[PDB]
Automatic annotation (TrEMBL):
Signal peptide: none annotated. Residues 100-110 have a biased composition (Basic and acidic residues). Transmembrane segments: none annotated. It is found in: Nucleus. This is Transcription elongation factor S-II, putative. Residues 9-95 form the PWWP domain.
């Protein structure tokens, strides 16, 4: 009984940092209780902690939230439309590109 789309570790989505600054977000599928995300936050406190990828100047942070979908969209970056003069945005653009619900699946790891 899943939704229309599928959820993966990579989770290709867009996160808004302000107004003209956005960064890639990936859900590791980590609850903050004991697996309450399989039912509903209404039960206890099902919190899904996600950790993006490290950039060139900014490092990935970890935050626990029900989903934060109201802050992040479901799509991919434009790259060129994001290119301007953001060192951090540059590195973020690369990650978001690599993370496509199939990261570390086709290419061999380190």
């Amino acid at each position: 009984m899943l939704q229309e789309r599928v959820f993966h570790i990579n989770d290709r989505v867009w996160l808004k940092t302000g107004a003209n600054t956005w960064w890639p977000a990936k859900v590791t599928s980590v609850t903050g209780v004991e697996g309450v995300d399989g039912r509903s936050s209404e039960t206890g406190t099902s919190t899904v902690t996600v950790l993006t990828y490290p950039g060139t100047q900014n490092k990935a942070t970890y935050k626990n939230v029900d989903s934060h979908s109201s802050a992040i969209t479901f799509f991919e970056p434009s790259s060129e439309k994001a290119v301007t003069a953001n060192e951090d945005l540059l590195q973020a653009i690369r990650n978001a590109e690599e993370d496509k619900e199939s990261n570390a699946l086709r290419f061999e790891p380190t």
